[PDB]
RNA sequence: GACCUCGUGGCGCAAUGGUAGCGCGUCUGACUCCAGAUCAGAAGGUUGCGUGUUCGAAUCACGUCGGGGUCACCA
RNA sequence: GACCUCGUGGCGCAAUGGUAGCGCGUCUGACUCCAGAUCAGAAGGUUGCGUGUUCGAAUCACGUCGGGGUCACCA
């Protein structure tokens with residue numbers, strides 16, 4: 059697989075150890091999410107400060123985002139939201155969700171309308187995760203920028219403090235890139251500062267922000283944490299997640315363009331079954347006999363990784379890990395287990411997504427005061 | 432002085448000749464402004480198309496701007512506004528005025544509040560020029576960006592179509608510059624496209640824009656005219672003005688930082704007199720005798736240039752030019768003439784500026800439908 | 805996060821025993837119808853801060869703030 | 880505005896008489912508990928457009944659209 063620990067050291071973040079997980083527990087009076095228990099969210103930045111502040115009755119809000127690449131969203135896009143939804147319940151803090159429709163516009167061969175529409179469409183799947191209408195504000199960059207008295211002002215503050223060389227270094231842009239991409243980083247940094255949401259944080263500028271996200275988003279936030287001090291703001295705390303494995307393997311890349319690259323949120327029970335059996339990479343031995351003797355390799359087995367993300371029952375997961383690893387369970391039954399887990403899951407999502415009306419999306423996307431300001 | 436014709440050829444613009452001036456006359460049933468008659472506004476881009484459209488009952492709006500460097504504005508900052516105010520009367524079109532408070536923020540050692548305040552303050556002097564409350568919208572970038580459904584969208588369209596190398600070339604930025612300056616050009620291009628003012632141009636995207644401005648602003652608009660086609664919009668037409676001379680000479684640079692660099696809009700009758708006599712560069716001969724024989728040089732004489740901008744009476748101006756040039760009038764009386772012209776002028780401005788209430792500024796700066804949409 | 809580099813008289817820049825210079829400026833007097841050139845002089849908060857090392861420090865160390873640059877192509 | 884450069888099979892790239900290649904992919908069959916490696920083959924809108932120059936053109940000229948680059952430091 060990939061060296062997450064070496065990644066941690068490389069970037070400079072911190073490993074989420076037991077003391078931290080226990081702290082989260084002690085701080086929420088609730089069992090830490092399996093993503094934490096199982097290592098899915100393994101890295102962090104300043105989480106203890108978040109915890110210290112929280113335990114000391116000081117506010118903090120969650121900030122996470124989504125790049126509306128298309129109307130197609132797969133099971134892997136949900137991880138950070140599934141986690142953030144949990145975080146919101148467990149800490150009871152307000153949440154801000156950024157739809158970078160303007161980023162996709164700058165990057166994909168998309169039109170502002172398509173981009174925006176994708177933002178709005180994805181918002182349905184995000185909302186379907188169960189976020190609290192009263193304490194979460196989903197917003198598209200294209201919309202919010204033009205209707206906020208604090209957001210642009212921060213983008214500008216942030217931009218006066220980030221040179222091209224910096225982004226060139228952090229993101230690897232080039233003089234050949236459009237000035238849109240060159241400065242986009244500030245747009246993603248901006249929601250890390252509460253006064254970008256005047257209508258919800260009462261012009262306050264010191265509310266602690268916690269950004270749960272996939273490890274590959276860290277560069278934006280390392281840059282953010284870097285300008286924050288320079289512009290009189292606190293730096294956002296982070297909770298990093300690992301990469302969701304593509305069906306072809308942890309190494310390989312997945313995308314809404316290749317349908318057999320992952321289980322998409324629209325897939326049917328049948329497609330769920332087909333995709334796993336016909337595409338989930340395996341760690342199981344070639345012949346059913348070699349497997350029995352050597353046991354399967356759960357480290358590279360995409361189906362087990364999947365279960366690791368969605369089989370909530372700790373004990374059940376272990377049975378599988380144990381029997382698969384020993385050879386007692388052939389990768390065929392493993393994949394069979396993953397399908398009985400995914401089918402009811404994707405179904406449920408499609409269900410609650412449908413219950414998301416236009417007025418509900420409209421609300422979520424409307425800037426307003428939020429329950430716990 | 433400076434080679435404006437060579438500038439015209441360099442840039443690629445067009446010289447405003449008699450046929451054009453006469454066209455403007457024939458098109459407005461009114462005598463073309465002295466800035467046109469005397470060469471102050473000497474260059475243009477597509478003015479005939481503006482005229483063709485206008486004469487053919489097709490709409491066009493004016494767009495001009497101001498960089499709120501400070502609360503201090505001198506007589507030279509007024510030229511493009513004095514002209515634009517005339518253009519508005521004479522063509523009866525709506526006008527849009529951009530206060531680039533975010534540009535000064537990025538460039539000067541200013542704070543967002545100072546920047547914004549300067550924008551609002553300058554708006555008073557601009558408004559004092561007599562623009563029509565019903566057909567002109569003065570706006571600060573810092574404000575409008577956060578309260579417009581079309582402006583940011585265009586900045587983004589414009590940014591996806593302008594590479595760093597381009598601006599590097601056009602403005603000479605460097606990898607060392609902040610991403611804020613790198614992409615600022617799009618912000619100044621954006622008001623060249625009517626749909627940036629949805630609340631006034633009814634989401635229309637083909638209304639002809641005419642940008643009166645100082646020749647040194649052309650680079651922004653050459654870049655604009657360049658992306659316009661690529662993003663399905665018409666390119667802005669231009670009317671270029673020459674540089675207002677600094678008191679130390681046409682060559683030398685002037686700035687709100689050096690008070691004796693020009694006559695400021697707040698100056699007193701006495702200061703007007705003092706500054707001219709004690710600082711206006713001259714083209715008059717050394718000794719009062721050499722002057723009589725050789726006559727003065729009106730080409731480099733800052734005081735005459737001044738009269739050229741503010742002595743509206745064509746005949747009177749000629750008398751001065753004639754007598755000064757022959758030696759009949761010593762530069763002392765010339766400067767005396769310029770002072771009797773400037774004093775009542777600056778006074779009048781200070782007068783009508785005072786009549787500009789906060790509610791009047793507030794109105795001008797409020798995005799709304801405009802008389803002639 | 806780490807490291808590197810710079811941080812000056814109003815701005816742009818200079819490694820002690822004589823006169824620490826003005827690119828550029830400001831200011832006063834003279835000459836000129838005026839402005840400028842010129843000539844004659846005058847003035848301006850010196851070292852980002854905080855400790856410390858030496859007989860002495862802007863020139864050294866530590867810490868700190870700020871500008872800039874830099875770290876397994878890429879979000 | 881001018882000039883330069885590129886523009887391909889789903890993407891990344893190649894200057895005719897034999898077999899226009901696959902970096903990479905897609906797809907079918909076989910073998911495997913499944914996925915992958917492997918083996919065996921199948922398919923995909925070829926030249927951004929529009930004219931034109933030659934017996935023939937993706938390889939030339941003109942025009943055009945689009946990506947990129949470039950022109951008296953600087954708005």
Ligand SMILES: N[C@@H](Cc1c[nH]c2ccccc12)C(=O)O
Nearest residue numbers: 122123124125156158246271275
């Ligand atoms: N760029 C992210 C979107 C995003 C914007 N802001 C964020 C903050 C946290 C995590 C992700 C985001 C994506 O492509 O999905």
Ligand SMILES: N[C@@H](Cc1c[nH]c2ccccc12)C(=O)O
Nearest residue numbers: 495496497498529531619644648
């Ligand atoms: N940059 C210009 C301000 C400006 C913005 N948009 C404009 C359009 C036309 C002329 C000037 C402007 C200045 O410094 O004064």
